[PDB]
Amino acid sequence: KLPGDFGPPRGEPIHAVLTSPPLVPPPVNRTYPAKVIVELEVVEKEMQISEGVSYTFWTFGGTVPGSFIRVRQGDTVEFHLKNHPSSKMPHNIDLHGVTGPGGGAASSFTAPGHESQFTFKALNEGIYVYHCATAPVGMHIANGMYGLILVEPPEGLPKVDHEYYVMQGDFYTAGKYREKGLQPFDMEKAIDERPSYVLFNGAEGALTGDKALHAKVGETVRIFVGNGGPNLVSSFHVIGAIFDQVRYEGGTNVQKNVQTTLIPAGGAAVVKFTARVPGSYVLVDHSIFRAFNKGAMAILKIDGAENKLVYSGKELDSVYLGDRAAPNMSAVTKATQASVSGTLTVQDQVQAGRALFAGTCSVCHQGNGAGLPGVFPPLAKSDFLAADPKRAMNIVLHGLNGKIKVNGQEYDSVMPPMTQLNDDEVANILTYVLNSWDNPGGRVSAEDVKKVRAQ
Amino acid sequence: KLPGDFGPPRGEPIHAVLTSPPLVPPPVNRTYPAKVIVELEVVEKEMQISEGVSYTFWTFGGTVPGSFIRVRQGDTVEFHLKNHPSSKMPHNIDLHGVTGPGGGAASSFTAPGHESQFTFKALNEGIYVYHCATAPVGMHIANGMYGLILVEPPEGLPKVDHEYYVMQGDFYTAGKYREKGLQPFDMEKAIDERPSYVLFNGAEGALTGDKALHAKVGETVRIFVGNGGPNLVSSFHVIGAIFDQVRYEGGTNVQKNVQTTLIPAGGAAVVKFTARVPGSYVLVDHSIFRAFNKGAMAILKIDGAENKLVYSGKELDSVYLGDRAAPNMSAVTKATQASVSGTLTVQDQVQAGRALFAGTCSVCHQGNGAGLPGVFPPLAKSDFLAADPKRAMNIVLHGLNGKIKVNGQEYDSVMPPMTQLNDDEVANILTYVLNSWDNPGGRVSAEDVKKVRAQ
Amino acid sequence: KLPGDFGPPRGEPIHAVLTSPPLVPPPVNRTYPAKVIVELEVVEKEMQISEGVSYTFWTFGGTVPGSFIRVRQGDTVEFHLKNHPSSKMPHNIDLHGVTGPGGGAASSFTAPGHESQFTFKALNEGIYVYHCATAPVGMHIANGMYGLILVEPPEGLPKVDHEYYVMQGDFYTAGKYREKGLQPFDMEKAIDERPSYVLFNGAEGALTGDKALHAKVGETVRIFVGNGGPNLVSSFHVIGAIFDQVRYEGGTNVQKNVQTTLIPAGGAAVVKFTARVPGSYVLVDHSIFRAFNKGAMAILKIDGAENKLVYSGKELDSVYLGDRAAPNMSAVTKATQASVSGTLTVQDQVQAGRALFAGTCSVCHQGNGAGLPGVFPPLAKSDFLAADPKRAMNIVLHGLNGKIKVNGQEYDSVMPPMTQLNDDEVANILTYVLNSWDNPGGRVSAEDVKKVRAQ
Numbered sequence A, B, C: 001k002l003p004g005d006f007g008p009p010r011g012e013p014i015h016a017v018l019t020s021p022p023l024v025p026p027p028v029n030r031t032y033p034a035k036v037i038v039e040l041e042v043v044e045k046e047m048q049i050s051e052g053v054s055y056t057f058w059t060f061g062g063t064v065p066g067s068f069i070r071v072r073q074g075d076t077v078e079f080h081l082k083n084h085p086s087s088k089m090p091h092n093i094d095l096h097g098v099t100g101p102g103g104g105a106a107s108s109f110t111a112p113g114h115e116s117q118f119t120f121k122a123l124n125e126g127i128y129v130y131h132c133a134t135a136p137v138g139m140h141i142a143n144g145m146y147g148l149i150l151v152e153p154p155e156g157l158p159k160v161d162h163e164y165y166v167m168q169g170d171f172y173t174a175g176k177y178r179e180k181g182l183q184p185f186d187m188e189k190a191i192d193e194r195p196s197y198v199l200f201n202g203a204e205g206a207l208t209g210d211k212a213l214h215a216k217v218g219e220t221v222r223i224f225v226g227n228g229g230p231n232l233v234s235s236f237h238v239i240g241a242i243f244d245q246v247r248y249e250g251g252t253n254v255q256k257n258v259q260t261t262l263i264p265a266g267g268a269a270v271v272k273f274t275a276r277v278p279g280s281y282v283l284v285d286h287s288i289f290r291a292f293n294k295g296a297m298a299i300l301k302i303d304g305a306e307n308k309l310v311y312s313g314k315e316l317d318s319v320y321l322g323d324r325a326a327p328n329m330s331a332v333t334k335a336t337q338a339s340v341s342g343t344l345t346v347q348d349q350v351q352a353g354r355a356l357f358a359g360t361c362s363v364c365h366q367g368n369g370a371g372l373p374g375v376f377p378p379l380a381k382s383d384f385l386a387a388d389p390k391r392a393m394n395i396v397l398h399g400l401n402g403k404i405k406v407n408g409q410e411y412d413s414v415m416p417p418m419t420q421l422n423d424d425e426v427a428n429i430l431t432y433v434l435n436s437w438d439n440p441g442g443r444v445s446a447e448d449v450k451k452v453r454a455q
């Protein structure tokens, strides 16, 4: 008498409601086992992985992660996979939580333009990763082919104010982080488990600024958190808060009151958060260079009244979140498109630089370029800058140390090199600086920086 | 009054029954503390890490992982380590679960041709890794020097139908994955934690195809799962099933109903599985490139009657498991030996290619080379191939995209590059294709591919 | 009615007692919520990361990890951060366990020579990592900016005989492991998560030999264990013992009786150990190349009476712990300083080599250089060595195999290459060998080895 033994399906078959991230379908709200028909379509498509950076994703339902599936333990699921005729590759599916070889893989093999089906009973309650299972499996997963299926316990999950859907992935581009253009998959980097981006929901900034998740003080938030991998294990953490509960897959064990929790590659967890004070709460992989150098940050923004007895501090700003504190970086997308078309203006560069200056430069030189006299020199009306604007390229790329004088004040400090900035980025930041705070104007081009880097 | 306080040893000393993977000794089936004499011998020996790839392993008892040791909490263990006189290195042992400095290491130091002993009381119930503890410790572990010791609780573990022994390891060869010949240990790759192979039980295919583990529908299977490392943490997972229970070392905590669980480097767990429906269940490290590009897959094959109410799908096939869906790849071993002896025939190559074509090429071009008209072009009687057979080398190594015509049908798709295939592999796959499905015949050599790669 | 609801602060404000690793402040020993004033100062400073290897650390309170903070759940904490005027960078703080955006980060932003404050209520009991939150966050963390804050439950933790403070970190130097001199931060290695050192408490040997932690047989030891990262997840393990209990952050779950446990990047745990038999117990990251090739080993030394019924073996020695079995390696620091000043004598080299020979060479050739006739050849009065002393450089760097004769005995074995040793190390070890056991004398210089490596 297997687990999930709740009887044959009753009533009429139900068409599963699938939702796109970061949203989840309604709770099933039923007390009997059903036949649930799931229809999921694979689409291969270019999308923006970062501003001005395109990638050819392979997707379940048009999104990364793929559509969220929600059924009840004991349901019989008739699973239809369609492969869009525009696809170049064959695809299939392995759903964790399926009891059967391959989790569906052999019977769901689907060539472009075709459809397949298989039927399984959902014996196991829990939150589960599903992903493509087509050789080379790692390429298909790295291209975005993963999502979550929730198999509810028979009584349903406890009611909460909000449910969200967040899934980490590691991505492997031929180009470096934030190198612009259409970036191919990089098999070498993937085999070595050296990702160029580590992301929530398939893109840089997918869940930051104006795309943050929302709740209010006093409300409960449940997040279904997946780790599609392919390779990385997430040190999954919420900055400035705690999880009331963390439950992995369909495990009997529930951990309560933790802030940092390890999600295996291919793993999934349900976490619960209670909003206590207003502000922005950051979901990160706390393997910190992923969070702050490769894109692995998401925001849950809580609105409501401050409570100074609990926290007197200010909201998250660019000192910590860097260039993602702002609503968006659309100016970088505009500038990159303008360079492609050969139509790049000084103002395109100024606006792109403005977005990129936040955190990256403002932490020391300030948002207004004033610096701090004798500690951090000014960029606003800087004589040192105006004397030799082109030297700024070497300063950004290779740093500056030693005694210098700026606006009649001596400095003897260290600006670290910032060699990871791409040529266009250095060009744009510097064009912004040159055209702000009554500086001389002019501009630096991507090709100017390339030549200096090449020295 | 220390834990495991069950009295002085009683009766006569017992000689421990040690077993080679994937098998385990009988349950001790006793109710009193004994003196248990363990005799374990270190042997350094070349073995096949993959087809036609040899490696000089250092082993406890002739195998990787080493012999399984099984005692009862409260036993006094008199541990004898012998180092075979053919050994070049000194060796010793640290058993997790030992209470004492080094877990035995200082007193078990054993030069080639010598023997050592130390005595310890097994105070701690649990499943524990043991490994060599001889500087450079990481080299000794990376060479295969690890195994499991089970310290039973006093009542014994619950009875199950089968017990098996599976242990993950990361391996570091100078050559790339599947590069043939005797491969040295690569210290650089090891320090960087960049393994070339990630394996269960010391070899590719050690537990796949005809070497799978077995059980029947309705039966319980306990697996003692170790992670010898040296470096990697396993996202340990069973495809298409769930673990009833996962228990780490001798921990009081037992997790129930999970599919994916993180095993630390040097860690060990006891997992329980109940067979529900027939087919092949894959144990993997779900850091996916390990599982599908570096060897980290093992099979538990369940025989019995299908249950279409639980799973209507087909058994695991080469679309998912690739070239390990088949019983074995002995043809690759034969072809590699033939190249060594200068006796390599066309048929040796054809049979080696046949083994390697499964998954790697058949996912798109099909097992019969028919492809799918207008979506994947045919390899069977392909005019495009016959027009310029040597171009096939560039197609496999560097991919093909753009408009082409094959057997009177237009294609406009993408075949990704497969540059990770070694020269012999490309040669053999192509010789198989050229000599199948009424294609022109002939052959490609490893040296032909080398020259094209070198372009 | 939030967690930690124990009332407004009562009594007078308390000035927090902060302690430097590996020590912890006294238990708060109180039954009422207080206002606790914390004053923590950031200092940037060069320290020795290894013998003769300097690094510019950025520190909370002058140490890595930073000062330990100890408060009670329900306390109101008024947190003052001062940035020393000698600092070149701005700094701030995110304390895990804070309920509020950034964990303090925006309001604690502090330029060199300035001070900031924010107030928070400690609602969440547990052990928590705190770290700098200043862009580039990963650089600041990698430079040493992390520590632990304990928020006690209201009843206090159970009494133990000793409390200690241990925190892992991964470090990224431009130079290789044990390459001497002032080593810059290496951003490339950090982004790739390829550390050169992995350390407890900010240095090689910080907690080994004469800097070990101590307890006696029968005593309980609690260790507050942090993982500052920035990037690595620790397979945290105690060699030759077991943890009675492991509790992560403020989690409700407590695991009992485990030896190996995974600590997320940014995570923290409280572990408990009961001393049973005397000797040295090694805390390691069991991703083994970290422990034995990158510095990740710490010692808890237990004094008291042997108990041969539990463990008959000898204390940890250089076969396992290598060059850290000894009290210290101060001779290496002396020799490195002498080379800097151009004052390096033969004896400076001999004493430095002596320290480095332990484990690295003695495992095979023995502490007395006698070797083992016919198995490992002698270094003591070695004719083979004396015939061509300079050949020894190639033997250490590239290994030796094949038939050789030494002191009238034939050998046919393998000495692996040791290419990871730095030029000064090879020079010093060889100068030690040449000047010991009635060998001919003379010396090898760092520049001699460089030239041979360069071949």
Ligand code: HEC
Pocket (backbone or CB within 6 Å): A360, A361, A362, A363, A364, A365, A375, A376, A377, A378, A379, A382, A384, A385, A392, A395, A396, A400, A401, A402, A403, A404, A406, A411, A412, A413, A414, A415, A416, A418, A429, A430, A433, C089
């Ligand atoms: C703190 C860590 C800094 C960050 C981040 C950035 N800069 Fe910087 N900068 C900093 C210091 C301490 C100095 C003086 C170095 C010395 O030798 O004492 C500088 C210097 C400059 C200059 C030249 C001086 C001037 O015109 O004020 C320029 C043009 C400059 N810095 C620009 C710049 C930009 C564009 C940055 C972001 C990309 C940036 N700096 C980051 C400290 C810090």
Ligand code: HEC
Pocket (backbone or CB within 6 Å): A089, B360, B361, B362, B363, B364, B365, B375, B376, B377, B378, B379, B382, B384, B385, B392, B395, B396, B400, B401, B402, B403, B404, B406, B411, B412, B413, B414, B415, B416, B418, B429, B430, B433
């Ligand atoms: C799908 C992902 C494929 C896999 C895996 C392999 N091949 Fe392929 N191949 C595929 C496509 C879509 C195409 C057409 C590309 C285009 O420009 O439209 C091809 C082409 C070939 C050819 C040439 C055409 C022909 O003779 O049919 C050859 C000889 C070929 N492919 C061989 C080949 C081999 C040996 C493979 C395994 C090693 C292999 N292909 C993998 C799709 C896919």
Ligand code: HEC
Pocket (backbone or CB within 6 Å): B089, C360, C361, C362, C363, C364, C365, C375, C376, C377, C378, C379, C382, C384, C385, C392, C395, C396, C400, C401, C402, C403, C404, C406, C411, C412, C413, C414, C415, C416, C418, C429, C430, C433
């Ligand atoms: C065991 C793993 C060894 C370690 C660690 C080191 N040495 Fe070694 N050494 C070893 C062997 C088996 C041999 C003989 C190799 C053969 O071809 O049979 C050697 C040889 C030498 C020699 C030359 C012979 C002699 O003078 O005895 C020298 C000078 C030597 N080894 C030095 C040396 C040093 C300095 C080491 C530490 C840095 C060292 N060896 C490590 C085995 C092993």
Ligand SMILES: [Cu+2]
Pocket (backbone or CB within 6 Å): A058, A089, A090, A091, A092, A132, A133, A134, A140, A145
């Ligand atoms: Cu796919």
Ligand SMILES: [Cu+2]
Pocket (backbone or CB within 6 Å): A094, A096, A131, A266, B286
């Ligand atoms: Cu999976």
Ligand SMILES: [Cu+2]
Pocket (backbone or CB within 6 Å): B058, B089, B090, B091, B092, B132, B133, B134, B140, B145
């Ligand atoms: Cu060994």
Ligand SMILES: [Cu+2]
Pocket (backbone or CB within 6 Å): B094, B096, B131, B266, C286
């Ligand atoms: Cu160990």
Ligand SMILES: [Cu+2]
Pocket (backbone or CB within 6 Å): C058, C089, C090, C091, C092, C132, C133, C134, C140, C145
């Ligand atoms: Cu800082």
Ligand SMILES: [Cu+2]
Pocket (backbone or CB within 6 Å): A286, C094, C096, C131, C266
């Ligand atoms: Cu943090």
